[PDB]
Structures are given as C-alpha cells and as structure tokens.
C-alpha cells in the first residue's frame with residue numbers, strides 16, 4: 001500500500017486503553033497499545049524481537065509489558081528491561097520498535113513514520129473535545145473500506161484552501177423547507193440561520209460544525225455541535241473510524257448521550273456504512289475497466305482534500 | 321477471467337424482479353435488475369457513475385431508479401434523467417451502462433458482452449415455458465463451482481435429475497447447438513420413471529434427450545410412451561436447465577420443468593420446484609464444489625481428465641465452448 | 653510452497669482410519685486415506701482420474717474405493733478395478749496415484765515425494781507407542797501456522813544438545829532444583845527429595861519425542877516415573893499444519909481417571925494457549941518478511957536453531973534438484 005507515515009493518526013480513544021494491552025493495526029503496522037501504571041500510553045510494535053509473538057497478548061509486570069511467549073519485558077520506549085534467561089543479558093537486538101504517542105484532546109495520537117521527525121505541533125486542533133463548555137460523547141467503528149472513501153463521505157453535504165487544512169463552509173438562510181434539525185429545533189422559535197461547516201486536517205482528521213441561531217447572530221453564539229470524524233488506515237482496503245460529538249446545548253441530558261453514542265446515529269448509518277463497504281467491493285471492477293468517477297458541483301471540497309492526500313502519498317513515496 | 325461474453329445468458333426469473341432492484345453478478349459484472357412502472361425490465365451496471373455506489377440499493381422515484389447515495393436518477397436505458405445538485409446539469413458522463421435485456425419464455429435474458437452483436441433473434445427457444453399446453457414450474461440455485469462443471473454434469477450419459485429416476489444414442493452437432501439423444505425401447509433397468517409411471521400400464525418406450533445452446537443453456541426431454549407412439553404425443557417433461565457464470569469459480573443455476581402430465585397437480589408442483597429433486601442433488605453439489613477446490617492442484621501439476629465412453633456429448637459441448645473462448649481472447 | 657517431499661510424515665492416527673475414507677491434505681497434496689477389509693491402510697490422491705471428484709467422499713465396494721461421482725473403483729495401488737461405463741474397459745489412464753504408506757508404532761506414515769526413494773527403514777522409532785509397558789493416549793490438532801513454528805515451540809547433566817545424522821536431542825536434568833522438580837501429575841509417586849528430567853528428540857523434518865520424568869534422589873533415568881510424549885508435525889499448506897500429539901507413560905497404566913487428565917493434553921503438547929502464539933506469529937509473517945526483521949536468538953534457542961537450519965538445508969536440497 002501507499003500510506004502517509006510521517007503524520008499523526010488516532011490509534012485509539014483513551015477509554016479503550018488500560019493495563020491490558022489492545023492490539024490494533026495502524027497503516028499495516030501491528031501495534032500493542034497500553035497505558036502504563038503511571039498513566040502514560042505506550043505503542044510498541046506488536047512483534048516481539050525474539051520470535052515475533054504478539055506483545056498485545058501479554059500483561060504488565062512491574063509496569064513492563066511482558067511478552068506472553070517467553071517473558072522478555074519492555075518499557076514504553078521499547079527497551080528490553082528484563083531477560084529471564086541465561087546471563088539475563090539485554091543486547092540492543094532485544095529492543096522492540098517504539099512509536100511516538102501524544103494524548104491530546106481525548107485522543108491517542110501516534111506517529112508511524114520516522115520517530116525523530118514526530119512534531120507535536122502538527123497534531124490537529126480538537127480542543128472542544130476537552131472543553132468544559134461542550135458535552136463530548138462518541139465511540140469507535142471498524143470499516144471495510146479504504147479510508148479515503150470515508151474522507152469523501154465526510155467532506156460531502158465556499159471552500160477555503162490552506163496549508164495542510166481545508167475548510168468547506170455552507171451558510172443556509174432558511175433552507176429547502178426549514179433549516180432546523182430536530183435537536184436544534186427546540187432551542188428557540190424566532191427565524192434562524194444555520195451553518196454546516198467541516199474542516200479537514202492533514203491526512204485524514206476532520207471536524208464539522210452544525211449550528212442554528214436566531215436571525216443573524218454570531219456563528220459562535222449559536223446552538224451547535226462539533227463533530228469529530230477521524231479516520232486511520234488499517235489496511236489498504238480497511239480503516240478505523242473515530243467519531244464524536246461535542247454539543248453545547250442540553251449538556252446534562254443523559255438521554256441525548258444515548259443516541260449520540262450510537263454508531264448509526266452520530267457517524268454513518270447502516271445504509272451509509274453499507275455504501276462505503278459496497279463501493280470498496282466494486283473497486284476491482286472499476287479499476288479493471290477504465291472507469292473514472294464523474295464529478296458534480298457538490299464535490300469541490302472532497303476533490304481538493306483528495307488531491308492533498310494524493311500529493312502527500314506521492315511525496316512520501318518519492319522518499320523511498 | 322475467462323468468460324464467453326458475446327452470448328445471451330439468463331440473469332433472473334421474472335418472479336424475482338419487481339420495482340425493488342435485485343443485485344446480481346453475471347460474468348463478473350454487477351447488475352441491478354429491476355422492473356419499470358410499465359413492467360418492462362431494465363438491466364443497469366450496479367455502479368453509479370458518480371462515486372460508484374450500488375444502484376441496486378435504491379428505489380424508484382417517479383418510476384426512475386434513484387441512487388441511494390446522492391440521489392441521481394436513471395431511466396431504463398441508463399440515461400441520467402435527474403441531477404438534484406448545482407445547476408442540475410446532466411452531461412453524458414452521468415450515464416450508467418445499460419445491458420441488452422429481453423424478457424422471453426418467462427426468462428430474463430441479458431447480453432453481457434459487445435452490445436453491437438446483441439441480436440434478440442439468437443436467444444435460444446424455450447417456448448414451452450409459455451406454452452399453455454404445458455405446466456411450467458422451477459426456481460433458482462447458487463453453486464460454488466465453475467459453471468462448466470455443471471454443464472458437464474447435465475450433458476452426461478443418460479443422467480437425469482432425482483425426480484426422473486428409472487434407436488439408441490446419437491450426438492448431433494451444429495453451429496452453437498448440440499443435441500444428445502437416447503431412445504430406450506422397453507429397457508432393462510426401468511423404462512417408466514417414478515413420476516411418470518401413473519400414465520397407462522402396458523409396456524413402453526422411453527426417451528432422455530438434451531439440447532445445448534451456445535454457452536450453458538440446456539433443455540432436456542424426459543419422455544415415456546406406450547408401444548411405439550409419436551415422440552411428441554408422449555407423456556413427457558421439458559426440463560429448463562440454464563447456467564450463468566457468476567465469478568470464475570461460481571455460478572447461478574436456473575432450473576425448470578415443463579410437463580404435459582398432471583397439469584393441475586400442486587403436489588407435483590412442489591417437488592418440481594425442489595432444487596435437490598429437479599436440479600442438483602446435495603451429493604452432487606458436494607462433488608462439483610469439491611472439484612472446483614481441486615482446480616488449483618490439477619492445474620499446477622499437469623493433470624488432464626481421462627475421458628470415458630459416457631462423455632461424448634459433454635466433451636463436444638466443452639470443445640465448442642472452448643472455441644468461443646478463443647474467438648474472444650483473440651479479438652483483444 | 654517449499655516442502656521436504658522425500659521424507660516420511662504422519663498422515664493420521666490409526667483410529668482416524670476405517671472403511672470410511674478420510675480426506676486430509678499433506679504438503680499441498682489432497683489424500684484419501686482408508687483401511688481395506690484386511691486392515692491394510694491405503695493412501696490415494698484425492699482426485700479421481702475421470703473428472704477430479706473427491707474419492708474421499710466415496711465408500712468402499714468390496715474393499716475398493718468407489719468414486720462418488722461416476723463410480724470408478726480403485727484398489728490400494730491406485731489401479732482402476734471397475735468401470736461401469738460402456739465396454740467396462742479400464743485403460744491405465746484411469747489409474748490414480750497411490751502413495752507409500754506404512755502403519756507402524758500406532759502411527760500412519762506416508763511418503764509424499766518420489767516413490768523410488770521411499771525406504772521404510774527411515775521411519776523414526778516410536779516403539780513406546782506400542783510397548784505393553786506403556787499406556788498411550790493422544791489425539792490430533794489442526795493449527796494455522798507454518799509447521800516450523802510448532803517445531804520451534806517444541807524444541808524450546810544440565811541442558812545439553814546432542815547432534816546426530818538427521819537427529820537432534822535437547823536434554824535437561826534438573827538435579828533437585830531450586831524452583832520445583834515436582835510436577836503436579838507426577839508428585840503422587842515417591843516423596844523424599846526428587847530429580848526431574850525434560851529431554852526432547854527431533855527426527856528429520858518434524859517428528860519429535862520428549863521425555864518428562866520425575867524420580868526420587870538419584871535413581872536411574874530409565875527407572876524413573878516418566879512419559880514419552882509424541883509430538884509430530886506434518887505440513888498441510890504453506891501456513892497450516894497437522895499436529896499429532898500423544899503420551900506414552902509408565903505409571904498408572906490401568907487408571908482410566910489418569911487417561912482423562914492426559915487427554916486434556918493442553919499441558920504437554922500445549923494446544924490452546926500454544927495454538928494462539930503460533931497462529932499469531934504466522935499472521936505477522938507478512939510484516940516481518942516485508943521489512944528486514946530477523947529473530948533475535950537467546951541462550952534457550954540452541955536446540956531450536958539447529959533443528960530450524962537442518963529443516964532449511966533439506967528444503968534447499970529439493971529446490972536444488974528441480
């Protein structure tokens with residue numbers, strides 16, 4: 001596959017991690033993701049340097065991940081800290097590869113490329129996920145399609161182009177009938193404007209803005225929800241979906257939490273998950289013939305994000 | 321893959337189609353087969369020209385199939401007839417391929433190859449399925465084997481279906497049509513078939529004929545008659561046995577029975593609608609599906625089949641099919 | 653795939669075979685295994701010479717395997733003995749390949765390569781399996797890993813490694829010990845201070861026989877209370893294999909309760925937690941091969957490394973011939 005490795009991707013949501021490691025594949029790389037007894041998240045290559053057993057099937061022993069096959073022990077940095085055989089010796093060849101991980105904005109970000117180039121300044125800005133003004137709920141979903149098809153889906157219903165960031169803004173005075181959603185509709189009564197924005201950040205992290213407000217008031221003074229919609233490639237033809245909603249209205253609604261923690265309700269439904277997986281199963285045919293997609297007006301935002309990913313995939317491929 | 325695309329194939333039975341589209345793959349081509357408001361059947365490539373969503377998961381909107389992804393609308397010809405986006409424009413690139421589809425003899429025929437060569441006069445004659453002189457029942461079956469294995473099985477020496485237990489032989493070969501004939505005067509095993517025997521009582525003649533038409537469409541003739549009565553004035557059933565490749569290693573089987581006996585017998589309809597009784601026994605599906613899993617081994621070693629006496633008709637259908645494979649492989 | 657075809661491998665346990673044929677694949681070769689009316693075991697290529705049907709889905713007709721498609725009949729040599737078609741003629745083109753098979757030591761051995769080199773004298777010695785002095789129990793397992801990984805797993809006086817011709821032995825005596833020399837099942841023999849042994853023998857390609865022993869003080873190794881475990885692997889595909897496991901013990905011969913706990917034989921030929929490691933190692937093969945990733949060997953690996961490289965040398969010899 002052709003992946004963009006020198007970039008931050010979400011590998012998990014913080015609640016998924018524990019002292020029991022989680023095995024998850026990121027850009028065709030099996031990682032063992034666990035949280036150390038002092039709370040710091042580690043990401044080790046899920047292939048023991050000895051005879052390749054899966055570290056993610058082990059447990060922590062004195063805060064060290066102990067391989068379930070023969071008991072080599074590893075720290076968050078990948079250094080072998082205990083060898084229970086023979087002279088107990090730990091040459092450098094017993095170290096497992098370690099990945100940069102930064103926990104920020106209720107997200108576990110990982111750098112799968114050159115670990116020396118990992119720069120926390122490049123992590124996309126998702127502060128609303130930790131903002132006490134917002135109520136943030138969400139979850140995880142696995143999808144059997146290449147990540148770019150869900151990037152299209154999400155970049156879909158003014159387009160500003162920046163460096164490693166793209167914005168697709170739509171302001172809707174009144175709409176086709178009423179430009180009010182059921183959750184927004186109960187807020188006020190006087191005539192309203194609505195917004196439907198989404199921001200794309202380098203590789204495949206996205207944040208939308210769904211808003212309704214009386215008359216023509218500050219966009220930020222509206223009743224709104226910011227959607228976390230982040231994709232991380234799993235294999236060339238599969239990916240992980242991290243979705244979440246940060247709402248500023250009816251914050252302490254235990255009922256609203258239920259519908260928004262649903263897979264079909266916050267991200268793509270059953271017919272919407274079926275569309276991307278179904279498109280993916282049609283890839284071999286469209287490629288075998290000369291079948292290229294037919295663009296419409298509503299595709300400008302998606303096409304520009306697609307071209308940014310294409311540039312990045314070619315630029316890294318040029319390196320190797 | 322290796323298919324003979326310039327030929328007519330059955331893609332569905334009429335009763336499978338309605339205004340809710342059916343997704344079916346024919347010779348590695350995903351089709352959406354649906355019936356328009358006036359009942360006329362359309363056959364579109366199941367890949368929307370926009371972002372490749374499956375049209376078969378859509379519905380009709382004012383009689384037009386609307387893609388469930390972004391709402392483009394198509395007519396029976398694949399023409400884009402509504403664009404709900406932007407200036408609404410409908411350039412030619414928003415057309416989806418349409419395949420020649422002809423509903424005839426209670427079968428839904430499709431031409432999966434070069435549409436310029438699709439000639440409805442070439443569709444094999446399965447008239448007995450609409451002949452009010454006959455009672456016609458049948459159904460559908462899917463099998464995990466290359467279709468030629470089920471064509472071999474059906475062209476096999478005096479081999480009938482389970483519900484059909486019991487001059488001599490003759491194989492006539494023509495252009496894209498083969499007939500393998502058997503007349504059994506009086507017999508030695510049995511001349512009355514279990515389902516037939518309730519016709520008359522005195523000693524009889526028996527027939528077991530089968531017709532093959534270009535690429536995998538077959539119609540057999542299982543017959544019983546007293547003494548020496550006209551072959552066509554006999555008690556008989558015309559069996560519809562049509563195979564359509566799905567993938568290189570799987571296929572669709574459309575089986576049917578056109579009988580002139582027990583026309584108003586619903587008990588008889590039940591068994592003849594049975595896929596193991598009429599088309600393929602469970603032990604035969606296991607053999608053919610098992611042979612398919614052996615294809616990689618026999619090809620990797622040099623293993624060619626050793627033919628017997630009971631194989632004359634099938635080997636000829638096999639060689640006719642192969643020539644057609646060559647005609648297409650040469651063109652491109 | 654790269655297999656060692658000029659070698660004996662177990663294809664089954666005798667109780668798996670009967671007059672009902674068994675389909676099993678050995679080194680990418682589909683076999684039909686059945687036992688003839690006189691008890692003699694035959695091994696035919698599971699591909700009928702007519703139209704490639706599974707012979708293994710057939711039945712015996714007068715001791716001859718009858719193909720379930722069209723009824724051809726085969727004897728133990730693969731010879732077609734009945735053709736129910738036409739003039740009944742049976743040209744040689746209707747014979748199916750037959751494989752050398754030798755039933756020995758309650759094992760079904762097969763030579764999947766060149767039949768001209770098949771020498772029953774090269775079958776490894778597993779006599780304890782038929783020794784009336786021993787009580788033998790075991791079974792079968794299929795595992796989704798290349799067989800070398802379960803040879804690695806199993807190859808893992810103090811610890812001494814003996815190397816012979818097509819034979820490697822890894823011996824361990826634990827004199828008295830410091831952790832424990834008493835095993836849970838063994839402890840109910842003697843009680844005053846004890847020695848323990850854990851040896852394992854590997855014979856060419858992938859047949860292994862271990863020795864688990866416990867005995868008081870310093871008594872003869874052959875006079876200990878012990879079990880000789882059968883651990884034989886046979887490749888199925890590039891990435892799957894058959895596991896034949898067994899226990900031949902000299903203690904509690906007539907104990908049917910004892911038969912039960914050793915038939916929970918996850919303990920010697922680890923097959924539940926141990927199936928999980930090798931299948932997981934196998935699923936990582938594409939990554940470790942795609943990068944230049946080689947295993948880092950330790951002190952506990954001398955036996956495994958020598959057996960692995962002998963398996964490797966034999967693979968090259970055959971790839972070299974062709």
Ligand code: FES
Pocket residue numbers: 048049050051052053067068069070071072
């Ligand atoms: S083999 Fe994984 S730690 Fe010894």
Ligand code: FES
Pocket residue numbers: 368369370371372373387388389390391392
């Ligand atoms: S795929 Fe976009 S309109 Fe059908």
Ligand code: FES
Pocket residue numbers: 700701702703704705719720721722723724
């Ligand atoms: S395939 Fe075995 S006899 Fe026809």
